[PDB]
Amino acid sequence: SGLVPRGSQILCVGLVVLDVISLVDKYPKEDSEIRCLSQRWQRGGNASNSCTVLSLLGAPCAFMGSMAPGHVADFLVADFRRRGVDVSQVAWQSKGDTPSSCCIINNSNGNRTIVLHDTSLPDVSATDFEKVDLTQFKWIHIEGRNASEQVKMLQRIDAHNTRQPPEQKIRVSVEVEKPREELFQLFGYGDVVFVSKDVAKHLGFQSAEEALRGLYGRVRKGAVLVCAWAEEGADALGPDGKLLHSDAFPPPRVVDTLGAGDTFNASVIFSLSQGRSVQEALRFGCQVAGKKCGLQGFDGIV
Amino acid sequence: PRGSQILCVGLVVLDVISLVDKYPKEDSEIRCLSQRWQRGGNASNSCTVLSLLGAPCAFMGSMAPGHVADFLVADFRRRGVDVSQVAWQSKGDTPSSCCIINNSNGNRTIVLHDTSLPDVSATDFEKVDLTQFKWIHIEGRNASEQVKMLQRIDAHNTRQPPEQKIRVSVEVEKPREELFQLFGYGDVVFVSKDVAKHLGFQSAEEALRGLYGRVRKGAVLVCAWAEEGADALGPDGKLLHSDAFPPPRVVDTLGAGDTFNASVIFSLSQGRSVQEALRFGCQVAGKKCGLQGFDGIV
Ligand SMILES: CSc1ccc(C[C@H](C)C(=O)O)cc1Nc1nc(N2CC[C@H](N(C)C)C2)cc(C(F)F)c1C#N
Numbered sequence A: 001s002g003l004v005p006r007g008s009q010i011l012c013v014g015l016v017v018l019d020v021i022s023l024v025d026k027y028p029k030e031d032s033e034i035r036c037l038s039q040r041w042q043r044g045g046n047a048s049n050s051c052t053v054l055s056l057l058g059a060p061c062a063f064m065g066s067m068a069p070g071h072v073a074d075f076l077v078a079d080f081r082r083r084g085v086d087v088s089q090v091a092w093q094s095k096g097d098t099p100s101s102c103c104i105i106n107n108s109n110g111n112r113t114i115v116l117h118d119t120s121l122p123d124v125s126a127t128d129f130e131k132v133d134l135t136q137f138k139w140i141h142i143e144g145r146n147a148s149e150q151v152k153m154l155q156r157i158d159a160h161n162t163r164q165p166p167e168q169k170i171r172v173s174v175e176v177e178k179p180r181e182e183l184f185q186l187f188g189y190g191d192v193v194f195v196s197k198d199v200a201k202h203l204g205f206q207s208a209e210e211a212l213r214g215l216y217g218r219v220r221k222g223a224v225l226v227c228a229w230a231e232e233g234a235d236a237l238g239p240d241g242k243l244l245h246s247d248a249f250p251p252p253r254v255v256d257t258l259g260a261g262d263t264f265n266a267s268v269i270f271s272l273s274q275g276r277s278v279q280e281a282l283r284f285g286c287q288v289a290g291k292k293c294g295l296q297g298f299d300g301i302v
Numbered sequence B: 001p002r003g004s005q006i007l008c009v010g011l012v013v014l015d016v017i018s019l020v021d022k023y024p025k026e027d028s029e030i031r032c033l034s035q036r037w038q039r040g041g042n043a044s045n046s047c048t049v050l051s052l053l054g055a056p057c058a059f060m061g062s063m064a065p066g067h068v069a070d071f072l073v074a075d076f077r078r079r080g081v082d083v084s085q086v087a088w089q090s091k092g093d094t095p096s097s098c099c100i101i102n103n104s105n106g107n108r109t110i111v112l113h114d115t116s117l118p119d120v121s122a123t124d125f126e127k128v129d130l131t132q133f134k135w136i137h138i139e140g141r142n143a144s145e146q147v148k149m150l151q152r153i154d155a156h157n158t159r160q161p162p163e164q165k166i167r168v169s170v171e172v173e174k175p176r177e178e179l180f181q182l183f184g185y186g187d188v189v190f191v192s193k194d195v196a197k198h199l200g201f202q203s204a205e206e207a208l209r210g211l212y213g214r215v216r217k218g219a220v221l222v223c224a225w226a227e228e229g230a231d232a233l234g235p236d237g238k239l240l241h242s243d244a245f246p247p248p249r250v251v252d253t254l255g256a257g258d259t260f261n262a263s264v265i266f267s268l269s270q271g272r273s274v275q276e277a278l279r280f281g282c283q284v285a286g287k288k289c290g291l292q293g294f295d296g297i298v
């Protein structure tokens, strides 16, 4: 690790997982031995994907998440470095496995069957976050996971900001992506709150407009709540009460939407960290995520 | 030392294992109980079991340099498996499999990523000093090349007294027509239940009686059949059977067939009768079925 200039990096806190994806002619019957058509090992995880996009956008970025020493972590660290991501804040654990998932894709109907990673590896704790020198960062994005610990991380960032002039305050964003009640306390933290379409629909909202008007009462004073809604584009709502919208920028052909939400989040964060307005950041998020949907992976998103 | 090692020729594959409570239905998401990496491949698993049984053993197979091969080589060396005969390739990736093991019944589902890594050739085998080995086991893969390897061993044996002859075993594990020429080679032929069922046989007894005509004169044909135990048939025409030794809780059968094969080979290499070797094979493979991996078999 070398010298990182003060207030230069965007940190994403969350999951990194090894996804082993196998394409098969037909779903294997239990207890059978089959050969796949093709296989690929990929680095996944919401915060992990957002770091890849931030590096491709030209932002110095860092990932913070748990990993256990071993060959799975070696593959993931080499893949983070292949995408220019700084991994010096990784919380190395002495117990548990580095997450790894198995995804079987049936080439005859596109069905995806997933065997998700085990929960043995401890999540990043508030005590792990206390050890991080914050001066390095201009923005910290947190993927909502172990909410009670992440609330203490957010309170530490808020305390840091009270002693800084407006120019050296660290901007904060949070993502509430899973419909887990424990995560809903995270709406009250951060300057920017991203809420997924899946969370909005599980809370009874049928559109991004409904979700933002119905959930704005939960954010802290001054915060911007953002909700992307696939082909329907994305909306944002700030303290002035004006609903902002951008239409989607769909590709000529949709080929891969995995990580489109992480691409949208990273692109909104990047645009706002560059001093752009919320309307401009919302449009930029739709532009980059729409372009990504027409490409396999993140190469060529620009 | 001369005639001290057992050589296993075949594949070495990285098995990326997920242990689950139940097999996932198509298009669903389930969470695994635990994850692990295991050095797999049929010949490779048989070397693990031979080293655990206390037999000096060597592996011969293709590998490509890289971090996955570093894990596999370190695992072979940790078990004292001799890797000096490995055919290192400059092209192709290390094969890897996603293995889903059902913890409630030991069922193992494997999705193999077979890479364009070149197989061990007859020219690679020509370079092997055979004096080192008392037994050579071949996992059926590139049959036309492996037939030349077997012919080289047969030619070597014609110039040796009975005490210095190398015993040979072959495994016909996949129902691929190209592999059926391998039945006519070796002193011991292992035929899988899957091959037997694909050729119309519904039991180990049916398979041995129906396929014995394919083995060379004097050979022993062996067929394991999961909970139904295993059978063997030699030149005297007497069918031999062993009941299985199932554990009270079956938790992992990945590599049970390789454990059975290695244990039969070990017992026969120690001078035991075919009946005793068949029982020993069932005993060790049955013990393995009640454990995750191969540790604790001894
Ligand atoms: C506005 S950019 C954005 C931001 C976050 C997300 C992800 C998030 C989970 C969500 O769905 O809201 C997606 C996108 N954007 C698209 N997503 C799409 N899908 C998502 C899955 C859907 N299939 C059917 C199951 C298809 C299709 C398109 C299409 F027009 F090309 C676009 C775009 N453009």
Ligand SMILES: CSc1ccc(C[C@H](C)C(=O)O)cc1Nc1nc(N2CC[C@H](N(C)C)C2)cc(C(F)F)c1C#N
Residues within 6 Å of the ligand: A031, B105, B106, B107, B108, B192, B193, B224, B225, B226, B227, B228, B229, B230, B244, B245, B246, B247, B250, B253, B256, B257, B258, B260, B281, B282, B285, B286, B289
């Ligand atoms: C006689 S030892 C042996 C030798 C070769 C094999 C593997 C070979 C492919 C075959 O199944 O013939 C298996 C075994 N043995 C067991 N396999 C079992 N399988 C249930 C799920 C798996 N399925 C059918 C493939 C395997 C269950 C038991 C149970 F009784 F504990 C035992 C034992 N004991």
